[PDB]
Short mmCIF file of N, CA and C and ligand atoms in Angstrom, two decimals:
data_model
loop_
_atom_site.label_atom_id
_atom_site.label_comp_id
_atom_site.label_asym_id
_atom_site.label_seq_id
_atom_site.Cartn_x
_atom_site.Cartn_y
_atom_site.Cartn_z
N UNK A 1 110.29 -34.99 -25.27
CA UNK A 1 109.92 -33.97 -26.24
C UNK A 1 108.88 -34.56 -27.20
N UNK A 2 107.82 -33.84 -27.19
CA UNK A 2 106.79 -34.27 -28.16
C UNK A 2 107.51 -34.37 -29.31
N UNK A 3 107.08 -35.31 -30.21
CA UNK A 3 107.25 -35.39 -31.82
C UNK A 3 106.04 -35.86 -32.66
N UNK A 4 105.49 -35.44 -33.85
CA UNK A 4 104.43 -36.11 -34.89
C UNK A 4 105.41 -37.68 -35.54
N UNK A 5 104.47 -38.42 -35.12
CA UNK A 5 104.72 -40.23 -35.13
C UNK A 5 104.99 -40.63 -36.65
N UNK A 6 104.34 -39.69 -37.30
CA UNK A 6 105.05 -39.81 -39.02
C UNK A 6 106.52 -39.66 -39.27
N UNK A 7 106.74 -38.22 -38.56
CA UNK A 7 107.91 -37.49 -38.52
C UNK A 7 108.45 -38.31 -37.70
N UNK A 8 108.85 -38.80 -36.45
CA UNK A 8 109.76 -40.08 -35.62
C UNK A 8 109.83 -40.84 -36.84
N UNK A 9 109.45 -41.66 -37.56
CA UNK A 9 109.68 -42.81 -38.12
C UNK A 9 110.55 -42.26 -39.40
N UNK A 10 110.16 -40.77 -39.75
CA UNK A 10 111.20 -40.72 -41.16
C UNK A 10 112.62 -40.55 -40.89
N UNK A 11 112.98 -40.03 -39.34
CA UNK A 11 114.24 -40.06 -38.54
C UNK A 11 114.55 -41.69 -38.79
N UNK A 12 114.03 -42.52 -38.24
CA UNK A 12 113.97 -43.90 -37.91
C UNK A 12 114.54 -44.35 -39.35
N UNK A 13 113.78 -43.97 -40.47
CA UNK A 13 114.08 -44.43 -41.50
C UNK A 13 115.82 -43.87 -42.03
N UNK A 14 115.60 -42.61 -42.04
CA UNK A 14 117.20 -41.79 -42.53
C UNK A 14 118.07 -42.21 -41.43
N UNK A 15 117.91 -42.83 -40.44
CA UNK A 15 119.03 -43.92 -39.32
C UNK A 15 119.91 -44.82 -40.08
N UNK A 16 118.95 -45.71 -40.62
CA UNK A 16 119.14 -46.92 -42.04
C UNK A 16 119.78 -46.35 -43.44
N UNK A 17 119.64 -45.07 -43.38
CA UNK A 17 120.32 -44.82 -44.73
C UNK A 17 119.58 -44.40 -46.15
N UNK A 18 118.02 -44.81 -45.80
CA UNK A 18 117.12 -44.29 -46.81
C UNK A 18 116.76 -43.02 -46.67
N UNK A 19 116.85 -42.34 -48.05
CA UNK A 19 116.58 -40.57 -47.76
C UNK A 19 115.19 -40.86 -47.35
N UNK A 20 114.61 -39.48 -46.48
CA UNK A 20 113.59 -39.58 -45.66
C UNK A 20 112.18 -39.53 -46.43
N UNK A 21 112.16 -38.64 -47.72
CA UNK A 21 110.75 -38.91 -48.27
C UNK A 21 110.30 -40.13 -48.28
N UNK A 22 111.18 -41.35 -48.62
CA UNK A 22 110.63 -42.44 -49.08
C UNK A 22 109.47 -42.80 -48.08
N UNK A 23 110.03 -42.38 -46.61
CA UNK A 23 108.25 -42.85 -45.31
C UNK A 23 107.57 -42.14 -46.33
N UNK A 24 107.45 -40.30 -46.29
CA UNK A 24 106.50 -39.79 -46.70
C UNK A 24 105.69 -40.11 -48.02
N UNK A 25 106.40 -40.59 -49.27
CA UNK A 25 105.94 -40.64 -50.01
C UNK A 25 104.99 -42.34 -50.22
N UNK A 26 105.20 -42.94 -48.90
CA UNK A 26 104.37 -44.18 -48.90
C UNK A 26 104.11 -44.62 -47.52
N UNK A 27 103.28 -43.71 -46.69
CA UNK A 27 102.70 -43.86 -45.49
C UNK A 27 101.97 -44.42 -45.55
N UNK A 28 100.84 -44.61 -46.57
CA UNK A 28 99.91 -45.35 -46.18
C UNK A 28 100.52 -46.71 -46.21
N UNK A 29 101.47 -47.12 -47.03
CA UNK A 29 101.71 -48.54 -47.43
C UNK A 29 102.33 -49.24 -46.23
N UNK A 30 103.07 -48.04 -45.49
CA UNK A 30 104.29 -48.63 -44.50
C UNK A 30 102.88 -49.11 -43.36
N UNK A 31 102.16 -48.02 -43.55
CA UNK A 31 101.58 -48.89 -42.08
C UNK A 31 100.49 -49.54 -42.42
N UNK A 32 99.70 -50.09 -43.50
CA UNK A 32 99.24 -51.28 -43.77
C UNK A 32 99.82 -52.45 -43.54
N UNK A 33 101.47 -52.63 -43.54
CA UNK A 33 102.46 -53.50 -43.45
C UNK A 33 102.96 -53.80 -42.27
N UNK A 34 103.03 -52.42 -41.11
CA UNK A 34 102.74 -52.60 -39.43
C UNK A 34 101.94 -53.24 -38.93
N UNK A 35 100.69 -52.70 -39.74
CA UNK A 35 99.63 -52.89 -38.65
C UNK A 35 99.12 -54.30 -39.27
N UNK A 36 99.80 -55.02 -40.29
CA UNK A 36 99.57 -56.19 -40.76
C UNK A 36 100.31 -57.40 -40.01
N UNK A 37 101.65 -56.94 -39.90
CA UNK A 37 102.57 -57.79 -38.98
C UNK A 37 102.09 -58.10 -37.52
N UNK A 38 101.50 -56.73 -36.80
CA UNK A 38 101.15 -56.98 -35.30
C UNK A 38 99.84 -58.13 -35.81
N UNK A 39 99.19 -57.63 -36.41
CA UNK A 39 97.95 -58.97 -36.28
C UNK A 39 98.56 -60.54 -36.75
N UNK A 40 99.81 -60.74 -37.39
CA UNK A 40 100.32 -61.80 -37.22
C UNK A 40 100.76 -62.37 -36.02
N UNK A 41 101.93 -61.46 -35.28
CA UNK A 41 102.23 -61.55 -33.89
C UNK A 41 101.08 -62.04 -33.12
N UNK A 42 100.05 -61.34 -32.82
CA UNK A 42 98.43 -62.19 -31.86
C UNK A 42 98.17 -63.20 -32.43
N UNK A 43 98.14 -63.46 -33.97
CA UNK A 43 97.46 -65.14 -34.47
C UNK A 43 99.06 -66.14 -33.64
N UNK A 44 100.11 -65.58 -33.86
CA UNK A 44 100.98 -66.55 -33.73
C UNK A 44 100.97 -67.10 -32.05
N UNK A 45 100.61 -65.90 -31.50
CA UNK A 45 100.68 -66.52 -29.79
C UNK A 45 99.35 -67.15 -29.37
N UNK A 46 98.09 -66.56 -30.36
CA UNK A 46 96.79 -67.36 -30.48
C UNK A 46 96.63 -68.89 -30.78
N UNK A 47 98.01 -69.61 -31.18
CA UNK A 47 98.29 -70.85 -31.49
C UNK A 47 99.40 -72.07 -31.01
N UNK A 48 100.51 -70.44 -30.72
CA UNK A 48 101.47 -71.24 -30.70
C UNK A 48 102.17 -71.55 -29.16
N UNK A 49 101.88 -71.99 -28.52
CA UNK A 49 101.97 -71.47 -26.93
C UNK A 49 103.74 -72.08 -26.73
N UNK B 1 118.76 -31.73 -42.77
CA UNK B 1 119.10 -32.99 -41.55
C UNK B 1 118.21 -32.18 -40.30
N UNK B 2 117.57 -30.72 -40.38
CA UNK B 2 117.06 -30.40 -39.25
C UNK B 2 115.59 -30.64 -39.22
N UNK B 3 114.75 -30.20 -38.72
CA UNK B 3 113.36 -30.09 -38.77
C UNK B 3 112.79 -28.92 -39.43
N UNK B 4 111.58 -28.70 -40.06
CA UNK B 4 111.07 -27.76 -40.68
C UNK B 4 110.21 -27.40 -39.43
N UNK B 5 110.38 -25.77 -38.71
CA UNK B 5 109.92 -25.51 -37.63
C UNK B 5 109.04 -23.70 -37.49
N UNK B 6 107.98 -23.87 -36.87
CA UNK B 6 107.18 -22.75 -37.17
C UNK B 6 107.00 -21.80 -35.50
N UNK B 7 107.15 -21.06 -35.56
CA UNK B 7 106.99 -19.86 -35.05
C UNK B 7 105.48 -19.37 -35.24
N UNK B 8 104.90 -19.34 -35.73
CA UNK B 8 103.07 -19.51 -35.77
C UNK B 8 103.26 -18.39 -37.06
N UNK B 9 104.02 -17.43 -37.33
CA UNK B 9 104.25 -16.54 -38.17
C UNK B 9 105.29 -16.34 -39.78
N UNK B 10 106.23 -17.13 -38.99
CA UNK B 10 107.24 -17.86 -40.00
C UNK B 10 107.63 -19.12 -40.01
N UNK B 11 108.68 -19.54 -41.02
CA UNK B 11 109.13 -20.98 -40.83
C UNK B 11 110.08 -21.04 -41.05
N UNK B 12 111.24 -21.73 -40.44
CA UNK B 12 112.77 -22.04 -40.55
C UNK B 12 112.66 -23.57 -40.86
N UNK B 13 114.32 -23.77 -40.91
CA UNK B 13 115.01 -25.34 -40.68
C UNK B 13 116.03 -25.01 -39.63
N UNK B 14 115.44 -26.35 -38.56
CA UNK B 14 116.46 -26.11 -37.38
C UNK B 14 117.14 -27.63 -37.06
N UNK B 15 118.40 -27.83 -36.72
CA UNK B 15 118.74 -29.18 -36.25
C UNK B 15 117.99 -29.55 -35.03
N UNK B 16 118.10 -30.72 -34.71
CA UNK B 16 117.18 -31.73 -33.65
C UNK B 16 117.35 -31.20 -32.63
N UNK B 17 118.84 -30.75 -31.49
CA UNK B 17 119.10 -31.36 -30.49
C UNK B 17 119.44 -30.12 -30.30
N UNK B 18 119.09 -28.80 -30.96
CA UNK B 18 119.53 -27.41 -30.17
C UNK B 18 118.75 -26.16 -31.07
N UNK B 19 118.18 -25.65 -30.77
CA UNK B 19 116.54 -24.61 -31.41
C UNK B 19 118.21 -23.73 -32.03
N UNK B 20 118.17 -23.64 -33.09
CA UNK B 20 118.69 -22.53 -34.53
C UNK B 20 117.97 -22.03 -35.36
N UNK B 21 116.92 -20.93 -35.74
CA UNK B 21 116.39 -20.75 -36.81
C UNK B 21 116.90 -20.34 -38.00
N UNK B 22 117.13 -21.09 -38.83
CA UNK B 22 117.66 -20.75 -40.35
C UNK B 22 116.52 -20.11 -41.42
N UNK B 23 117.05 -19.33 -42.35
CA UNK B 23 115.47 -19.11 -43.39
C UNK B 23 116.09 -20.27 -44.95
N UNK B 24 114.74 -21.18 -44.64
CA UNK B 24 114.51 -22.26 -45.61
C UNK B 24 114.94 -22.02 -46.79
N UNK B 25 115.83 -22.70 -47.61
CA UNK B 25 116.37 -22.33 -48.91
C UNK B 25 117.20 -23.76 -49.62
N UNK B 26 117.20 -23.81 -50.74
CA UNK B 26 117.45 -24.62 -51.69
C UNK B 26 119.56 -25.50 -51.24
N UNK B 27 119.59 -24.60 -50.21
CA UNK B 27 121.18 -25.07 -49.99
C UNK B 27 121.01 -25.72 -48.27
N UNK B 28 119.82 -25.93 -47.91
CA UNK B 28 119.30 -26.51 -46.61
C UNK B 28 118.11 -27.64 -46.67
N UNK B 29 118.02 -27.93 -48.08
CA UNK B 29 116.47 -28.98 -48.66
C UNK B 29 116.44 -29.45 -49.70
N UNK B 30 116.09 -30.45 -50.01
CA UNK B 30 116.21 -31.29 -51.04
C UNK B 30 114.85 -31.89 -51.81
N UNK B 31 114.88 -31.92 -53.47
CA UNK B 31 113.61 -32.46 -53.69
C UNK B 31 113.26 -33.12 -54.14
N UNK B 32 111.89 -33.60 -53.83
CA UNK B 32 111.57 -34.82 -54.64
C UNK B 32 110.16 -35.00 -54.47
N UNK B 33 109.89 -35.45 -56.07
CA UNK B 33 108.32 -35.58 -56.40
C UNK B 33 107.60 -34.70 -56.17
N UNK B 34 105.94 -34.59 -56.00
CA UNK B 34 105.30 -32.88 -55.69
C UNK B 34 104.60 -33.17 -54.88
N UNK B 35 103.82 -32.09 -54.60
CA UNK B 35 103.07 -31.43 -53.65
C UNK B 35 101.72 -32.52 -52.85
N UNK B 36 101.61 -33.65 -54.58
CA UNK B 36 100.08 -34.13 -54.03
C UNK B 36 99.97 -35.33 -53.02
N UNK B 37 101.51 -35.56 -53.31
CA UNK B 37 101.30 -36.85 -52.26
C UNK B 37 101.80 -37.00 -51.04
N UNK B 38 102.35 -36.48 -50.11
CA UNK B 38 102.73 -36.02 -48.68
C UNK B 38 101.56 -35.73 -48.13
N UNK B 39 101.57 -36.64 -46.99
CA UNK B 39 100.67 -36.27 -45.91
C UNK B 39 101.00 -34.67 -45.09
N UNK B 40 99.83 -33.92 -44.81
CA UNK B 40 100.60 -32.50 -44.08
C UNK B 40 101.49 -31.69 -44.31
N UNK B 41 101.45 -31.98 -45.83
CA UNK B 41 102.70 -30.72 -46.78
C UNK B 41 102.25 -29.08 -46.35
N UNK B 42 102.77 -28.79 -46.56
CA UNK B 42 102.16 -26.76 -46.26
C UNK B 42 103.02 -25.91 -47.05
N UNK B 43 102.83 -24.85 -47.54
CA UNK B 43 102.53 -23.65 -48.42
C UNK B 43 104.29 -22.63 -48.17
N UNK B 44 104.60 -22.44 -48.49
CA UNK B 44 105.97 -21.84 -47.98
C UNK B 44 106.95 -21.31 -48.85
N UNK B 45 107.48 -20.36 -49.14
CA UNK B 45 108.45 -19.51 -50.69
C UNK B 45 110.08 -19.80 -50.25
N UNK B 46 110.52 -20.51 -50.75
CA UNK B 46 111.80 -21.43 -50.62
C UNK B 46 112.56 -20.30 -51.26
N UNK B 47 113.77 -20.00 -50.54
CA UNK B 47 114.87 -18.86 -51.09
C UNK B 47 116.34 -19.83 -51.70
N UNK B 48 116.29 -18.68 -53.41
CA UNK B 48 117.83 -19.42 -53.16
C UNK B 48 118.88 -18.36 -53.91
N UNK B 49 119.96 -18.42 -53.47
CA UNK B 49 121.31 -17.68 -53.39
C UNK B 49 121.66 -17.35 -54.23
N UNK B 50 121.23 -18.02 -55.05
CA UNK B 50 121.92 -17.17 -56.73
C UNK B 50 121.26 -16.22 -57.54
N UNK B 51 119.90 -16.45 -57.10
CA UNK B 51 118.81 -15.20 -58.02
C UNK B 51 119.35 -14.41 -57.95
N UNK B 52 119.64 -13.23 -57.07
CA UNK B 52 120.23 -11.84 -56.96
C UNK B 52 121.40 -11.67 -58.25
N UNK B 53 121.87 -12.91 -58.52
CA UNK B 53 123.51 -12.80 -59.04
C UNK B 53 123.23 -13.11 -60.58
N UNK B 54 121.90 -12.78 -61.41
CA UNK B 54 121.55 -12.83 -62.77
C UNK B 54 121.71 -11.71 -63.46
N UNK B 55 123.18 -11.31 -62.69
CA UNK B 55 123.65 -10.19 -63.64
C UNK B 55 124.27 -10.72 -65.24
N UNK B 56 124.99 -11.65 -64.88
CA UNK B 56 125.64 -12.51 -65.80
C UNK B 56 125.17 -13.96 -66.54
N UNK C 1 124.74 -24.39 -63.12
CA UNK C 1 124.83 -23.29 -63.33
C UNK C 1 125.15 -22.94 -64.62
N UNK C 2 125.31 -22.93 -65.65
CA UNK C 2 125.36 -21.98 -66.48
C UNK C 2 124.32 -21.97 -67.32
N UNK C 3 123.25 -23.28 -67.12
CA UNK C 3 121.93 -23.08 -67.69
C UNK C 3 120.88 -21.95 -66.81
N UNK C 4 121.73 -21.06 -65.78
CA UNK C 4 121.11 -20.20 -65.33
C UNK C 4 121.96 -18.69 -65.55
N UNK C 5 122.54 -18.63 -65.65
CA UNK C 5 124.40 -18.19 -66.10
C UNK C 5 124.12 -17.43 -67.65
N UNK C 6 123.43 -18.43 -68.57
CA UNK C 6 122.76 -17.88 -69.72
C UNK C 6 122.13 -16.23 -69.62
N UNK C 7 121.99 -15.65 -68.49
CA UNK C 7 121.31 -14.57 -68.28
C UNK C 7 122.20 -13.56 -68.50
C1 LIG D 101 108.79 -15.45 -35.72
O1 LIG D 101 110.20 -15.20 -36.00
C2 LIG D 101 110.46 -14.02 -36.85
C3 LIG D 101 111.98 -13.84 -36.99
O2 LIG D 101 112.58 -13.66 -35.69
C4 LIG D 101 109.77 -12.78 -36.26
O3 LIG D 101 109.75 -11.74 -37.29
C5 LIG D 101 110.61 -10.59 -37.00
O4 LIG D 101 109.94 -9.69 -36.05
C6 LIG D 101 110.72 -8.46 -35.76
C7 LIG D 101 109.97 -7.65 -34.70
O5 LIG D 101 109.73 -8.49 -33.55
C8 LIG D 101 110.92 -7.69 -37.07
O6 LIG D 101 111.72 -6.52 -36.82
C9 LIG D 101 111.67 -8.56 -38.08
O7 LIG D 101 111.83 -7.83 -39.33
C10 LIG D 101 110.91 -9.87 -38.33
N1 LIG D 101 111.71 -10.75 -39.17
C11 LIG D 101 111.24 -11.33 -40.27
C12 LIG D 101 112.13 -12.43 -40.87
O8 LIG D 101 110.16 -11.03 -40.76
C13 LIG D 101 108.32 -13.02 -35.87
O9 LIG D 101 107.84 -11.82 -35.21
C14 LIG D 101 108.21 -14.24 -34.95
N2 LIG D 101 106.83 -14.48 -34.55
C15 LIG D 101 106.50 -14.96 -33.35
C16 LIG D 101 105.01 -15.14 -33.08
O10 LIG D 101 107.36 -15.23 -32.51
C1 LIG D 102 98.78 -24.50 -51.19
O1 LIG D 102 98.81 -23.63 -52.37
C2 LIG D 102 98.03 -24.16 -53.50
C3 LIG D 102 98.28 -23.30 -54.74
O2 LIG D 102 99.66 -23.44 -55.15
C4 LIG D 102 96.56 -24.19 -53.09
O3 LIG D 102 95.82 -24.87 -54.17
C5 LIG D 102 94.61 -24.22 -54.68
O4 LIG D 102 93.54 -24.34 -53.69
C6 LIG D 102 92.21 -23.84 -54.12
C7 LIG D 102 91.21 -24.01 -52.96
O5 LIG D 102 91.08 -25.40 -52.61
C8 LIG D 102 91.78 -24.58 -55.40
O6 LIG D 102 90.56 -24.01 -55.91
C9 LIG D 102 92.84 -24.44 -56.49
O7 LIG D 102 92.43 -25.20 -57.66
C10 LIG D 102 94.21 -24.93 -55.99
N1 LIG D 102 95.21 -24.68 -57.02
C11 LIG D 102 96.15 -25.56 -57.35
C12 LIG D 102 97.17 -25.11 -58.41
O8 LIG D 102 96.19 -26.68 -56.85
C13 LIG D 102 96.35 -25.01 -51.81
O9 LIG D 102 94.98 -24.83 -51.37
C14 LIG D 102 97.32 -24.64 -50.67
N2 LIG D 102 97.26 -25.68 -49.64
C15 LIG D 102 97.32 -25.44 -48.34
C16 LIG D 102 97.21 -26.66 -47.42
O10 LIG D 102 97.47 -24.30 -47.90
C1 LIG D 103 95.59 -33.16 -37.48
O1 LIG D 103 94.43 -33.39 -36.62
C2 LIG D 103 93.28 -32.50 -36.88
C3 LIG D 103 92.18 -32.85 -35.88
O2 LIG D 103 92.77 -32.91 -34.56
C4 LIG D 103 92.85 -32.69 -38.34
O3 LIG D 103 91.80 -31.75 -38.66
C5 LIG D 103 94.01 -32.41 -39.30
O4 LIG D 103 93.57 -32.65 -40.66
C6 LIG D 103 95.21 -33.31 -38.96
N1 LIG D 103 96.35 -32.96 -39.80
C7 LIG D 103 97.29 -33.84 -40.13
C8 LIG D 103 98.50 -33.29 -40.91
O5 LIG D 103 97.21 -35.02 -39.82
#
């Protein structure tokens, strides 16, 4: 079943117990912080064999 | 706990895992903060149960 | 409710 990838993650989030605005009210931040971690993950295998 | 779900004409709240259309109202939603900061917020007249009863 | 109740 299709779903909007914002909307999956505020499920994801109210799983854990946090009411669900909190994704909405800081999307941009959450995925500056994703998409910050994956580029750690590539430096780390870029080094660490 | 359901999804906010559109019919192209109206809009309900329905749970996840079985299509129910409810009409959106203050005893099915909860709030917080406003309008400006949600990504893809939309426009919609929220009903609630007690207006009618301002007899008293 | 009765700050609506006032009515
Ligand atoms: C979206 O759902 C609503 C509710 O079922 C539909 O509106 C109803 O349409 C019937 C006639 O088909 C009217 O007699 C009712 O009074 C309407 N109800 C309300 C709440 O207005 C609407 O037609 C549906 N639209 C689509 C595209 O499916
Ligand atoms: C949702 O409704 C609000 C009004 O409550 C709309 O906001 C107005 O939009 C016009 C056109 O851009 C502006 O000139 C007004 O200054 C706005 N008024 C306020 C009070 O903000 C808004 O456009 C609607 N949004 C959507 C996505 O439908
Ligand atoms: C959804 O995508 C369209 C383009 O496909 C864009 O115009 C629109 O602003 C987007 N809306 C949201 C809520 O992301």
């Amino acid at each position: 079943l299709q779903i909007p990838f914002a909307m999956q993650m505020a499920y994801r989030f109210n799983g854990i117990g946090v009411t669900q605005n909190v994704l909405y009210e800081n999307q941009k931040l959450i995925a500056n912080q994703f998409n910050s971690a994956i580029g750690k993950i590539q430096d780390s295998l870029s080094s660490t064999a | 706990e359901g999804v906010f779900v559109s019919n192209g004409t109206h809009w309900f709240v329905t749970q996840r895992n079985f299509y129910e259309p409810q009409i959106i109202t203050t005893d099915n939603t909860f709030v917080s903060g406003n309008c400006d900061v949600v990504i893809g917020i939309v426009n919609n007249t929220v009903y609630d149960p007690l207006q009618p009863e301002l007899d008293s």
